[PDB]
Amino acid sequence: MKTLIEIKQTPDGIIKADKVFNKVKDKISLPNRILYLGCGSSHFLSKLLAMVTNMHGGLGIALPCSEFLYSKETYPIGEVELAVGISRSGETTEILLALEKINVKKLGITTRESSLTRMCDYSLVVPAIEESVVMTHSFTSFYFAYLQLLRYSYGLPPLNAGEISKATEKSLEYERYIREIVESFDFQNIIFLGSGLLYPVALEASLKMKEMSIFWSEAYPTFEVRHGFKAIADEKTLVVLMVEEPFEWHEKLVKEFKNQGAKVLVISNSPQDLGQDYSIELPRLSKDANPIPYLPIVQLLSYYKAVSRGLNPDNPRFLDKVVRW
Amino acid sequence: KTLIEIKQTPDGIIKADKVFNKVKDKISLPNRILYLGCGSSHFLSKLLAMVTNMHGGLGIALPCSEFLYSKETYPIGEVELAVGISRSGETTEILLALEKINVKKLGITTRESSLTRMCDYSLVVPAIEESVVMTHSFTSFYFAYLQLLRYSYGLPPLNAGEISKATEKSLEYERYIREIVESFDFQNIIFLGSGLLYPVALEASLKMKEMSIFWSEAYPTFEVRHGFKAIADEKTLVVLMVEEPFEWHEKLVKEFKNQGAKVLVISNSPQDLGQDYSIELPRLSKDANPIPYLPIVQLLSYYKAVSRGLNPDNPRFLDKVVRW
Numbered sequence: 001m002k003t004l005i006e007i008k009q010t011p012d013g014i015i016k017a018d019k020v021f022n023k024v025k026d027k028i029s030l031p032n033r034i035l036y037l038g039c040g041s042s043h044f045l046s047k048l049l050a051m052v053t054n055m056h057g058g059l060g061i062a063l064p065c066s067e068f069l070y071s072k073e074t075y076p077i078g079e080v081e082l083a084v085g086i087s088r089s090g091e092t093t094e095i096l097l098a099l100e101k102i103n104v105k106k107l108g109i110t111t112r113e114s115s116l117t118r119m120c121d122y123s124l125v126v127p128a129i130e131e132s133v134v135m136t137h138s139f140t141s142f143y144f145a146y147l148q149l150l151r152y153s154y155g156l157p158p159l160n161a162g163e164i165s166k167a168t169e170k171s172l173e174y175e176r177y178i179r180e181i182v183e184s185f186d187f188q189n190i191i192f193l194g195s196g197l198l199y200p201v202a203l204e205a206s207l208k209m210k211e212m213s214i215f216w217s218e219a220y221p222t223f224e225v226r227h228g229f230k231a232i233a234d235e236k237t238l239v240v241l242m243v244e245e246p247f248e249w250h251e252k253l254v255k256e257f258k259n260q261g262a263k264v265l266v267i268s269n270s271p272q273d274l275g276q277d278y279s280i281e282l283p284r285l286s287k288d289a290n291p292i293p294y295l296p297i298v299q300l301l302s303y304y305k306a307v308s309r310g311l312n313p314d315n316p317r318f319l320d321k322v323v324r325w
Numbered sequence: 326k327t328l329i330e331i332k333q334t335p336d337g338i339i340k341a342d343k344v345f346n347k348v349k350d351k352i353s354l355p356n357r358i359l360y361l362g363c364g365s366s367h368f369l370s371k372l373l374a375m376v377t378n379m380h381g382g383l384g385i386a387l388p389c390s391e392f393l394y395s396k397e398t399y400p401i402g403e404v405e406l407a408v409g410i411s412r413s414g415e416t417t418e419i420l421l422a423l424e425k426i427n428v429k430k431l432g433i434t435t436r437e438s439s440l441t442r443m444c445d446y447s448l449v450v451p452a453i454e455e456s457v458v459m460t461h462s463f464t465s466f467y468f469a470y471l472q473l474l475r476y477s478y479g480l481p482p483l484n485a486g487e488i489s490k491a492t493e494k495s496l497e498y499e500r501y502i503r504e505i506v507e508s509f510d511f512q513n514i515i516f517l518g519s520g521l522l523y524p525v526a527l528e529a530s531l532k533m534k535e536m537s538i539f540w541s542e543a544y545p546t547f548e549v550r551h552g553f554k555a556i557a558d559e560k561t562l563v564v565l566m567v568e569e570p571f572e573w574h575e576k577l578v579k580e581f582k583n584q585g586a587k588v589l590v591i592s593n594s595p596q597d598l599g600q601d602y603s604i605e606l607p608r609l610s611k612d613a614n615p616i617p618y619l620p621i622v623q624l625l626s627y628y629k630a631v632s633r634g635l636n637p638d639n640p641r642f643l644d645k646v647v648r649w
Contacts, residue, residue, distance in 0.1 A: 039548060040548065054400050065548075066547035067519060074376070076384060076385055094547070195391060210555060214555055214556055223394075224364065227363045227364025228531055231534060231535050316552075318555050318584055319555055325573065
């Protein structure tokens with residue numbers, strides 16, 4: 001098994017990411033208008049990067065590779081000063097096809113020299129090597145490397161890699177707790193909730209559960225879930241609410257789901273009791289880096305659920321490590 | 326009431342055209358527009374934003390609560406018009422969102438409401454619905470606004486009669502759709518679409534989710550190969566919606582069938598991609614083309630719900646209007 005080992009390499013991945021950042025920081029200038037392209041988990045990472053770009057005063061837009069390829073006219077792309085292609089393998093056909101249609105500067109984010117790096121002007125090669133078909137610590141490592149570069153390019157002070165790495169070590173301390181939730185509550189479906197930067201994390205968490213456990217998992221911007229989506233949550237459902245600073249509406253939402261019979265796990269940077277059945281408190285970090293510790297938590301949850309179902313997260317049925325056409 | 330309301334789609338198109346003509350010279354839609362809505366109204370907001378971009382403007386859509394609590398993470402920028410979409414016009418979140426907006430506001434709703442009272446202008450399309458689940462109002466709202474957008478941007482008007490008749494053709498598929506539900510007892514479903522058909526896929530999935538308390542998912546057509554397809558097997562129905570399919574679509578259909586899933590292709594093409602079920606719809610102007618797809622997915626969701634002994638009019642746990 002490699003998936004669990006790879007999730008546990010998250011702390012080191014942060015350090016590796018910082019090293020890459022420092023090597024290329026004075027070689028790559030990130031502009032104001034940036035387009036982020038990726039497929040699957042890399043698309044969710046693209047969404048996260050676009051969001052943090054907007055958070056820091058820039059203009060970031062993210063699109064799934066195939067939507068850019070065949071339906072770009074329906075998206076608010078506008079003028080692009082830099083196109084960022086994200087691919088763990090650097091060999092996904094769609095990203096290669098997408099970038100070849102772009103004429104502006106191109107930056108690749110991948111784990112190794114590849115077809116992708118060969119067609120980009122420069123790349124962030126973060127060696128967060130993964131043998132599992134399911135992406136885990138590379139998501140987190142890629143995010144940190146680019147975030148550092150973005151802050152640097154925009155004239156902001158650097159983040160403390162050591163502190164962020166330690167924060168993910170704290171996330172990993174919840175391994176036993178997470179395993180026991182999986183062993184005690186045999187949920188049949190699950191919903192991940194998050195807002196802002198935590199929304200793409202919810203999307204990624206849902207995909208991890210989907211791929212690793214061949215599972216009925218959904219993800220939504222925190223409060224959007226009340227609009228019909230919540231109809232599928234009952235006593236067989238685990239609702240995972242991820243929130244940095246909860247307020248009154250969060251307590252009401254937790255209670256609403258419990259009233260439907262569902263159990264609720266709250267992953268937050270707050271000690272507040274919202275009425276949740278399970279609680280995971282993570283170290284609060286700079287707003288942009290704060291989502292990082294959440295990733296190993298949702299990855300561990302998906303891994304243990306997969307094992308509890310006798311499934312192999314390293315090679316989910318029907319999936320290829322690299323999607324080609 | 327849900328079925329009756331779905332079948333009112335043809336008349337809804339006509340009602341929509343009437344509203345458009347009444348307000349077309351009272352408000353001219355600008356280049357930069359922000360679209361806000363919750364649930365199905367968010368998916369309609371995405372669709373409107375997309376067609377705005379398609380016609381040369383700049384449209385951005387965000388769920389109401391994301392605008393309320395996390396606007397900084399979104400590429401909103403300068404806004405010349407804010408469009409608030411709400412079937413009821415009473416959703417707390419949309420009202421909270423618009424009260425914070427100082428730029429010009431346009432509401433899209435079915436009736437005089439709290440929403441219309443806080444907007445500068447409104448498209449009140451009387452596609453009244455008693456069902457908790459939104460059906461023909463989605464389609465009617467879209468057409469009314471599309472006409473207004475085309476008009477504002479200097480494009481010729483769409484033929485409401487032709488579009489209305491196209492939805493009548495969609496309704497002819499009612500008993501075929503019932504037969505699909507009867508002949509293949511699927512346990513989960515995936516809706517696929519690209520461009521304007523992606524928000525339709527999202528809406529379709531929500532209809533199935535609400536009406537049938539069902540495991541339904543939706544993705545941009547080819548994005549589904551990236552991990553998501555792992556949950557599709559012999560108990561899955563995959564619904565591919567595509568205007569003009571090409572080689573990749575045939576390969577995708579074959580890919581799902583190889584996993585054991587059955588495939589329904591809803592398209593404006595006579596091409597056989599290897600699908601198990603086929604629904605061909607009248608091809609319309611690119612922007613209006615998604616319209617006939619809505620009654621199809623609404624009917625599929627309705628009949629699946631009834632087959633499960635559920636009441637689509639009032640799904641468990643849901644309120645007609647989400648209030649705080």
